From a paper:
HTT is a large 3144 amino acid protein organized into N- and C-terminal globular domains of HEAT (huntingtin, elongation factor 3, protein phosphatase 2a, and yeast kinase TOR1) repeats. HTT has been hypothesized to serve as a scaffold for protein-protein and protein-RNA interactions. HTT forms an extensive interaction interface with HAP40 which confers structural stability to HTT. We have identified and characterized macrocyclic peptide binders targeting HTT.
Informed by our crude mapping macrocycle binding sites, we determined the structures of HTT-HAP40 bound to macrocycles HHL1, HL2, and HD4 (Complex1), and of HTT-HAP40 bound to HHD3, HL2 and HD4 (Complex2). These were resolved to 2.1 Å and 2.3 Å respectively. The structures revealed that macrocycles HL2 and HD4 bind exclusively to HTT, while HHL1 and HHD3 bind at the interface of the HTT-HAP40 complex, this is consistent with the SPR, FP, and HDX data. HL2 binds a pocket in the HTT N-terminal domain. HD4 binds a pocket that is also strongly negatively charged like the HL2-binding pocket, though the residues forming this pocket are primarily in the N-HEAT domain. HHD3 displaced fluorescently labeled HHL1, suggesting they bind at similar or overlapping sites. As inferred from the HDX-MS data, HHD3 and HHL1 bind to the same pocket, which is at the HTT-HAP40 interface. This pocket is positively charged at the HTT interface and negatively charged at the HAP40 interface, and both HHL1 and HHD3 have a positively charged surface docking into the HAP40 interface. Notably, although HHL1 and HHD3 bind the same pocket, HHD3 consistently showed stronger performance in pulldown assays.
Author numbering:
A (entry chain D), E (entry chain C): 2 to 18
B (entry chain B): 83 to 219, 256 to 305, 309 to 371
C (entry chain A): 317 to 329, 349 to 406, 664 to 970, 983 to 1053, 1064 to 1109, 1126 to 1164, 1228 to 1331, 1353 to 1377, ...
D (entry chain E): 2, 4 to 17
F (entry chain A): 2368 to 2478, 2496 to 2525
């Protein structure tokens, strides 16, 4: 579908800093 | 479950449609109230069910339906009781709904010729409407201001009809009747009332003390367009009692 | 002819010329004479369109006195004139052509046989004559022929007004089109004559000879309201809707009352469209004016049968129609009754109201509050909250209280399912139009010892066995319940459950609503996931919730099989988004100890709801984050009369403004809904979704989420940067809705340093904003929304290179300074320099005044609006006083003519610029500084002489006398442009409004100059100039300004009262004025 | 009947 | 010359008459 | 006016709220007594729904208003028979002849049709009970 699917590479992670 | 209250109120609406068919639609002389005994029983059960569910606002709606049915079926003294039950169930949670129900109780007392009961209910209304609806948080808010105008005019006519002696003449009555005189203040005393109605009510409270019967006749036709039909009935009773008193028997 | 009939609407707004549009019109006139009635039908439908939505160019040519000439059987017996005549406007010929072709024989009281002309062609012709009469009412009073017929066959001449004989034709649509012709004729005569009906009628009676009178129409409307056909009845009350308020405002107000009385019977009609048209008719009526008319009437109260009471129109309209039709069996009629009720609340009048004791005071407030409006300017909580106090109108609170009480009484006493639903719809929409947290006294029931209204009554319905199963009424009840609980917060908050709430009596209500919302959202989650029922949102053990699941399952299954992707009314999606909206609202009152054991459950439900309502689900996710991080409301919470309204309150407010001038680890539960929101943004066209995802990310960056770990390889910023390539080129649709949210997100991304590199940097953000400017797309729509985030950051709350970026941003604002939204940003820049550097504030103030004043002089500022003029007036207070101190720049930017006075926009821009200079002079300089510099600069009063004004309409001594003539000539220009200009034809509704506001502002200046005591030399110059001839007819005489001002009595009484005040301040006490405005012995509300 | 228009000219209609 | 009577407020009493 | 006794002239009904209660019991009694006059009684006995159904005989009598009693076939419709029952209860009867004519019409109906049989049984009950009225044998006024 989406640009991570199209670029075949992963989404990140949610974290505080 | 709570759906039992829906079954009982839909059953009561069927019995009340049967009683309305017999008493109002057909006007049968052979009617004896068996559908109404059934309606009062099913609404009684649904009222108690709503109360054990902790839904007193839903119980009050069923009290209003029975009270309206009793009033429409020619039993106003009975309807006044259930309208007051509804007002009592609503009052801690819906003060303006309680004032609507007390207004229907007072109308029912006037139909039942229960003038001292009507005088007490309107006095309770005027107290509650100042308590819940006449604050800065002082002048009344619009919905309560309409109740205050109704009570004031009706109480003045009921006090002119009944004329209570000392100690029956409450501080609330003495204080209302004090306003309907003039002495020293011209260079706004109308309060919640329209100024034209206030000057005619002032004039009526004075003409009745003077027994000025031709002034009361004059004021009755002038006030006719300004009053409700219930209030025109009250003003007729004041003029009637002035020309020909009750309790004399002859 | 059909293609032209579709094209005509799009060319009212290389361009279509006057000659092209005249050829469309002349083709249309030609083809009405065709042998085929299909072609005649297409030509009359085109002519109907051409009159309902006139092209701007064509409308001028059809109404001008020679505007085209200045640039089977044909049944026309004699000379009707021509399209090319020089002696009268083309609509006079057009109405004669339609009449002679289709409606009239030339013989009095003969209808054209239906053998000769079919009823559909008669109906189209009657419709076209009405649409022409709407633009030019003189057309109706014509003789049918310019030259009489053979006279032996026609012994009396026929007027066009004989078309009203079609009121008793056999066809319902012919009778009804005739009723609508009566309606539009009444409205047009009253509006065109400015309610001077007897003078306008006596003129047209002299020009055409016709004895027809406007009072002859009212019997025809009354007749057709009582028609046996529902079609004719719908058209007759449509004719009343078009003219009733104009009648009430006129010398025929008694006929206005009669039409209001005679429509009230239509509430009983079997046709639902008569009921909705009655509701829409009654929704237009000003009950303040009706209350004035009722108080005046002696015998309208008696009716036909000597009734003994007082008519009571407002009580009957509110209770017996509008609230009565909330119980209507048709949901379409209930919806229109609920919408009509909201329109009525402002218009209601009641005795003893402290804001307005008398209905003439109530109307005088409405007249004054538009035109005597002052020129003014100067962690977010959810939809239904209001922490700060407000200046609510007590009269509006009283009206709202009385309405809410009537609708609540019917809701409590309701015997029938339809009235319960309609009262919940009416209350829900009132809670939107008059929010409970602003109008808390209007909504008060006495319940809290700021308000909660009837909330327990609404929650009792949500707890009923039947009411939840009507999805529309259940939506309305959830929305209403949330609005009633939210409005408690200014009183019931605390500085173990619901620990924030303070007033413990509300916790049962809040817990009841929150538990219910979680159950209905769980039902929607199961319906969308295709799973069967069998933990606060658990419902498998509750009989009422199983019935709700069946209704929602059936509604969604009906949706799965269709492709109506444009439909707003889908009841499952409407229900789901209403439950999510109300959950979002309740979460402002919540705390982590209210939510910390069920946040996992709600996020599970939101994941199911996301693919159906992704936008409103993202709003819930943001509200849950505000509850977790403690940034929500629960966590952050540490007499008058006529002299007053028409003059004294406006004047005290104006003279005060002149004096103030120059004086936790649960965060990892959110990852899948954040990642779905990112993936959705990159796969969608919905700009309202895309706005919400950028708002979510901006919030996650403010909550110190590591953006570099969320957006691995900057894939999302890369995508967002590529959208500008389509936004600049005009290809990205609805991008006006996304730009401010992108720029806000990118300015936050400039501060962060989770990596050792900067992510975006302010140089790029300035370059992207300059790309929106350079690419040539509309500034107010695209470039200005991009600057607003950037300016607020850099000047309020943002290494010395930053000062060069601030100077570049000022270099952006100067390229756009004509737009008032950029003057707002200069007010923010100037105040942030004033607090920090006096010398930089002085340089900027000179840099701005040296640009602004030349542009005012050339009409280059976009200040043709009260909002824009207000923003310019505050900017001149915020500029450093030195920058305006040698008044010769100001005086050279005033004391100009425009390039033309032929267009309304140019006159408005010119006068707006003058009023902006004039206020700076009378506030920030003394009379002697002004008058001494005027005498040295060599201005003259002949700048705007009547001879100069007249050539500018066609195309292109002492200082105290000079200044006073200039202001007195501007009064004459405004009075002519208000009295001597036609609506839609020559000016728009907003232009007519802004002319009146300019005149109200100008007359308030003259009142301050003459009354304050500070401008004595100007008061003497004015007192001399009002008391002279016009210097040989070169200037307006006081007689000519008074002839115009008399003509405004019936239409602008507030402006006329300011003019009366000026006449007293110059001692013009001639009884030829005062005896006529005061009506001395030797009806209309605006006269009173 | 006869009609003159600005943008056409002197057209005739049977009668 | 009418006044209210002390023992009943609805009874009038007379001073100048 | 005889229709208005269900609503506008029913004491304490919502539609009576514009009439002061000193007029309601008077006007009710007057209307019942005017509806019994030979001049108008025959017309008043006819249900208005029967005129909407187009029934149109020639009236006779000394005044020109003496309509016959309604054909039994109309009275087989529920809510035509109820309209008739309301009139025969409200007006009562002016003579023995009118009692026997109204008994004959109720037996002609008596002979979901169980609804008409219940209406007829209730109607006949009300008819025979009306003769138990005491100062005058069949006059509700």
């Amino acid at each position: 579908x989406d640009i991570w699917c199209e670029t075949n590479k992963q989404t990140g992670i949610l974290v505080l800093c | 479950g709570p759906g039992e209250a829906l079954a009982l109120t839909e059953a009561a609406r069927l019995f009340l449609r049967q009683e309305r068919d017999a008493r109002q639609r057909l006007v049968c002389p052979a009617a004896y109230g068996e559908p109404l005994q059934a309606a009062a029983s099913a609404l009684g059960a649904a009222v108690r069910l709503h109360l054990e569910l902790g839904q007193p606002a839903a119980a009050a709606a069923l009290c209003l339906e029975l009270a309206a049915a009793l009033r429409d079926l020619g039993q106003p003294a009975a309807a006044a009781g259930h309208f007051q039950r509804a007002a009592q169930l609503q009052l801690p949670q819906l003060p303006l709904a309680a004032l609507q129900a007390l207004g229907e109780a007072a109308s029912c007392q006037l139909l039942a010729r229960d003038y001292t009961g009507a005088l007490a209910v309107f006095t309770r209304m005027q107290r509650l409407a100042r308590e819940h609806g006449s604050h800065p948080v002082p002048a009344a808010l619009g919905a309560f201001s309409d109740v205050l105008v109704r009570c004031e005019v009706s109480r003045v006519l009921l006090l002119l009809l009944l004329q209570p002696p000392p100690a029956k003449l409450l501080p609330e009555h003495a204080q209302t009747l004090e306003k309907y005189s003039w002495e020293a203040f011209d260079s706004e005393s109308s309060g919640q009332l329209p100024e034209e109605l206030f000057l005619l009510l002032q004039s009526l409270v004075m003409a009745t003390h003077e027994k000025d019967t031709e002034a009361i006749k004059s004021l009755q036709v002038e006030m006719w367009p300004l009053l409700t039909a219930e209030q025109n009935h009250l003003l007729h009773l004041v003029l009637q009692e002035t020309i020909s008193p009750s309790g004399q028997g002859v | 002819l059909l293609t032209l009939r579709y094209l005509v609407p799009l060319l009212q707004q290389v361009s279509p010329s006057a000659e092209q549009l005249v050829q469309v019109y002349e083709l249309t006139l030609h083809h009405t004479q065709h042998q085929d009635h299909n072609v005649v039908t297409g030509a009359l439908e085109l002519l109907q369109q051409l009159f309902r939505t006139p092209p701007p160019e064509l409308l001028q040519t059809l109404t001008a006195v020679g505007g085209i000439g200045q640039l089977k059987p044909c049944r026309i017996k004699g000379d009707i004139g021509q399209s090319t005549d020089d002696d009268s406007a083309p609509l006079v010929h057009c109405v004669r052509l339609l009449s002679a072709s289709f409606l009239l024989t030339g013989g009095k009281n003969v209808l054209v046989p239906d053998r000769d002309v079919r009823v559909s062609v008669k109906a189209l012709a009657l419709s076209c004559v009405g649409a022409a009469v709407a633009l030019h009412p003189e057309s109706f009073f014509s003789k049918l022929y310019k030259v009489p017929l053979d006279t032996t066959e026609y012994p009396e001449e026929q007027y066009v007004s004989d078309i009203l004989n079609y009121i008793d034709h056999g066809d319902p649509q012919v009778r009804g089109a005739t009723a609508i012709l009566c309606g539009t004729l009444i409205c047009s005569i009253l509006s065109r004559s400015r309610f001077h009906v007897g003078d306008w009628m006596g003129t047209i009676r002299t020009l055409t000879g016709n004895t027809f009178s406007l009072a002859d129409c009212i019997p025809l409307l009354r007749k057709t309201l009582k028609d046996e056909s529902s079609v004719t009845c719908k058209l007759a009350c449509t004719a009343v809707r078009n003219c009733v308020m104009s009648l009430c405002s006129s010398s025929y107000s008694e006929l206005g009352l009669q039409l209001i009385i005679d429509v009230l019977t239509l509430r009983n009609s079997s046709y639902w469209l008569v009921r909705t048209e009655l509701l829409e008719t009654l929704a237009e009526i000003d009950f303040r004016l009706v209350s004035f008319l009722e108080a005046k009437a002696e015998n309208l109260h008696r009716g036909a049968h000597h009734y003994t009471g007082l008519l009571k129109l407002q009580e009957r309209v509110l209770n017996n129609v509008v609230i009565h039709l909330l119980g209507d069996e048709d949901p379409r009629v209930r919806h229109v009754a609920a919408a009509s009720l909201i329109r009525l609340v402002p218009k209601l009048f009641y005795k003893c109201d402290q804001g307005q004791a008398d209905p003439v005071v109530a109307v005088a407030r409405d007249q004054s509050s538009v035109y005597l409006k002052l020129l003014m300017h100067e962690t977010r909580i959810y939809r239904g909250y209001n922490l700060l106090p407000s200046i609510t109108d007590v009269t509006m609170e009283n009206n709202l209280s009385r309405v809410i009480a009537a609708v609540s009484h019917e809701l409590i006493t309701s015997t029938t399912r339809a009235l319960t639903f309609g009262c919940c719809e009416a209350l829900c929409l009132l809670s939107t139009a008059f929010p409970v947290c602003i109008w808390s006294l209007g909504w008060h029931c006495g319940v809290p010892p700021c308000t909660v209204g009837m909330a327990t009554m609404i929650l009792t319905l949500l707890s009923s066995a039947w009411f939840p199963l009507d999805l529309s009424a259940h939506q309305d009840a959830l929305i209403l319940a949330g609005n009633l609980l939210a409005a408690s917060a200014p009183k019931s908050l605390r500085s173990e459950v619901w620990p924030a709430l303070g007033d413990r009596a509300l916790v049962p209500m809040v817990e009841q609503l929150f538990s219910h919302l979680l159950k209905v959202i769980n039902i929607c989650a199961h319906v969308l996931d295709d799973v069967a029922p069998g933990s606060l949102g658990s419902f498998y053990h509750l009989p009422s919730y199983l019935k709700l699941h069946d209704v929602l399952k059936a509604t969604h299954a009906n949706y799965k099989v269709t492709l109506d992707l444009q439909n707003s009314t889908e009841k499952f999606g409407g229900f789901l988004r209403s439950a999510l909206d109300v959950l979002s609202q309740i979460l402002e009152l919540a705390t982590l100890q209210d939510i910390g054991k069920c946040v996992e459950e709600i996020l599970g439900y939101l994941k199911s709801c996301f693919s159906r309502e992704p936008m409103m689900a993202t709003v819930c996710v943001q509200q849950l984050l505000k509850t977790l991080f403690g940034t929500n409301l629960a966590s952050q919470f540490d007499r008058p009369g006529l002299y007053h309204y028409c003059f004294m309150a406006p004047y005290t407010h104006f003279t005060q403004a002149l004096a103030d001038a120059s004086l936790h680890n649960h965060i990892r539960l959110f990852e899948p809904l954040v990642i779905k929101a990112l993936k959705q943004y990159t796969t969608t066209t919905c700009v309202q979704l895309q706005k919400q995802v950028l708002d979510l990310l901006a919030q996650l960056v403010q909550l110190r989420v590591n953006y570099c770990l969320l957006d691995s390889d900057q894939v999302f910023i890369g995508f967002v940067l590529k959208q500008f390539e389509y936004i600049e080129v005009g290809q990205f649709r609805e991008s006006e809705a996304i730009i401010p949210n992108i720029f806000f997100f990118l300015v936050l991304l400039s501060y962060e340093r989770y990596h050792s590199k900067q992510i975006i940097g302010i140089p790029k953000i300035i370059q992207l904003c300059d790309g929106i400017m350079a690419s040539g797309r509309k500034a107010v729509t695209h470039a200005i929304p991009a600057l607003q985030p950037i300016v607020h950051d850099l000047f309020v709350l943002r290494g010395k290179e930053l000062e060069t970026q601030k100077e570049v941003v000022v270099s952006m604002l100067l390229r756009l300074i004509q737009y008032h939204q950029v003057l707002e940003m200069f007010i923010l820049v100037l105040q942030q320099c004033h607090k920090e550097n006096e010398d930089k504030w002085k340089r900027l103030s000179r840099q701005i005044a040296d640009i602004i004043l030349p542009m005012l002089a050339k009409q280059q500022m976009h200040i043709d609006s009260h909002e824009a003029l207000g923003v310019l007036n505050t900017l001149f207070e915020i500029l450093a006083p030195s920058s305006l101190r040698p008044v010769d720049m100001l005086l050279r930017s005033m004391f100009v003519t425009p390039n033309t006075m032929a267009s309304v926009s140019t006159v408005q821009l010119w006068i707006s610029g003058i009023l902006a200079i004039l206020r700076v002079l009378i506030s920030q300089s003394t009379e002697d500084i002004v008058l001494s510099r005027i005498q040295e600069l060599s201005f003259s009063p002949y700048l705007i002489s009547c001879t100069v004004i007249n050539r500018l309409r066609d195309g292109d001594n002492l200082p105290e006398e000079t200044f006073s003539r200039f202001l007195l000539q501007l009064v004459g220009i405004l009075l002519e442009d208000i009295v001597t200009k036609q609506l839609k034809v020559e000016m728009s509704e907003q232009q007519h409004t802004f002319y009146c506001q300019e005149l109200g502002t100008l007359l308030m200046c003259l009142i301050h100059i003459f009354k304050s005591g500070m401008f004595r030399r100007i008061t003497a110059a004015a007192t001399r100039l009002f008391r002279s001839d016009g210097c040989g007819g070169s200037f307006y005489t006081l007689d000519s300004l008074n002839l115009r001002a008399r003509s405004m009595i019936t239409t602008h009484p507030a402006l006329v009262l300011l003019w009366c005040q000026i006449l007293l301040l110059v001692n013009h006490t001639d009884y030829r004025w005062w005896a006529e405005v005061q009506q001395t012995p030797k009806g209309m509300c605006n006269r009173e | 009947y006869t009609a003159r228009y600005l943008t056409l000219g002197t057209l005739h209609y049977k009668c | 010359x009418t006044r209210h009577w002390q023992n009943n407020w609805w009874i009038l009493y007379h001073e100048f008459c | 006016m005889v229709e208005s006794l269900q609503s506008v002239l029913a004491l304490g009904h919502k539609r009576n709220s514009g009439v002061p209660a000193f007029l309601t019991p008077l006007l009710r009694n007057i209307i019942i007594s005017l509806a019994r006059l030979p001049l108008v009684n025959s017309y008043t006995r006819v249900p208005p729904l029967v005129w909407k159904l187009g029934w149109s005989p020639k009236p006779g009598g000394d005044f020109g208003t003496a309509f016959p009693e309604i054909p039994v076939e109309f009275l087989q419709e529920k809510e035509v028979f109820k309209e008739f029952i309301y009139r025969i209860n409200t007006l009562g009867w002016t003579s023995r002849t009118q009692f026997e004519e109204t008994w004959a019409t109720l037996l002609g109906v008596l002979v979901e049709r169980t609804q008409i049989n219940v209406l007829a049984v209730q109607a006949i009950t009300s008819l025979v009970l009306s003769a138990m009225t005491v100062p005058v044998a069949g006059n509700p006024a």
